Amino acid sequence: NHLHEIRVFENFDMVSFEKGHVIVTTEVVDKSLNYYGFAHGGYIFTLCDQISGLVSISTGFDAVTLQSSINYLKSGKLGDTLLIDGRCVHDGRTTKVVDVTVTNQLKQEVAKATFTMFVTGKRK
Amino acid sequence: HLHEIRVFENFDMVSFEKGHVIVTTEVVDKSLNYYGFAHGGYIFTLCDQISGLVSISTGFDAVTLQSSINYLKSGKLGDTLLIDGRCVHDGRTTKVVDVTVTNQLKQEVAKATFTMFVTGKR
């Protein structure tokens, strides 16, 4: 299942959920377009932040985002399908670090991010 | 200077000058995650929007190329956020914007740096 793990601010469909590795997909719709015709930076960032929270949960912990760095490599356009992949690269006592990639249907990398998460407790 | 950008998270304009834009907003429930905090993407979007405004204030259209953000203190229901964006580098091809988010108690809530890639004259 894994619906209801987090509050959904930007819609996505769950693809796979495993320890330290979560994959979801979404489609770029009108709501996310800026006036330049691109998926806005905050939309792409939120998809990555959401998945970083899911990845922390997948390691067995609640955590808050402490710091994040994101690169926008290629624009997302109306109708694009985005595959968002989050992988834990450091599963620490106090911090988790998550690498996130966002890829389109042409397998071009749209964005990449690193999230540093501060652990607040053991899950459920 | 409303009208400059598409608004994804609401804000009220406080001041708009060349290289320096300030806006304000209130944290409402729709932005709260299950931990009761304004979610990271909501804060980031406020910062990304003001970085767009700052780039426009310098005379240029730009797209976000890279951004780093630190979440220093959580935003809570009812908090008033002051978002201040300052161009620290007004370059030919890139603009760099230093963004600070503070609360009513004057505590620093978040700090971000946006690297904007210039696409043309506004």
Ligand SMILES: CC(C)(COP(=O)(O)OP(=O)(O)OC[C@H]1O[C@@H](n2cnc3c(N)ncnc32)[C@H](O)[C@@H]1OP(=O)(O)O)[C@@H](O)C(=O)NCCC(=O)NCCS
């Ligand atoms: C920053 C850092 C300490 C975060 O720790 P973490 O995410 O909890 O990761 P770990 O679980 O692997 O713990 C690393 C060490 O920090 C300690 N630590 C973790 N959380 C701690 C906390 N809350 N308070 C005190 N120590 C803590 C652990 O006990 C562990 O100590 P050990 O070496 O005796 O086993 C860790 O990522 C790190 O050591 N990074 C390298 C920092 C570095 O070398 N910087 C450049 C040179 S200064």
Ligand SMILES: CC(C)(COP(=O)(O)OP(=O)(O)OC[C@H]1O[C@@H](n2cnc3c(N)ncnc32)[C@H](O)[C@@H]1OP(=O)(O)O)[C@@H](O)C(=O)NCCC(=O)NCCS
């Ligand atoms: C990265 C950087 C080049 C971006 O350029 P910018 O935002 O356009 O900034 P500026 O307008 O001040 O231009 C800086 C230089 O880059 C050149 N430049 C700007 N845009 C360019 C472009 N599109 N293509 C080729 N050159 C360009 C300018 O001509 C200027 O060179 P000049 O000293 O001969 O006049 C600039 O911020 C910089 O020089 N940063 C320092 C990089 C550094 O020292 N890194 C560590 C050591 S390698």
Ligand SMILES: [Cl-]
């Ligand atoms: Cl690419």
Ligand SMILES: [Cl-]
């Ligand atoms: Cl826009």
Ligand SMILES: [Cl-]
């Ligand atoms: Cl406040």
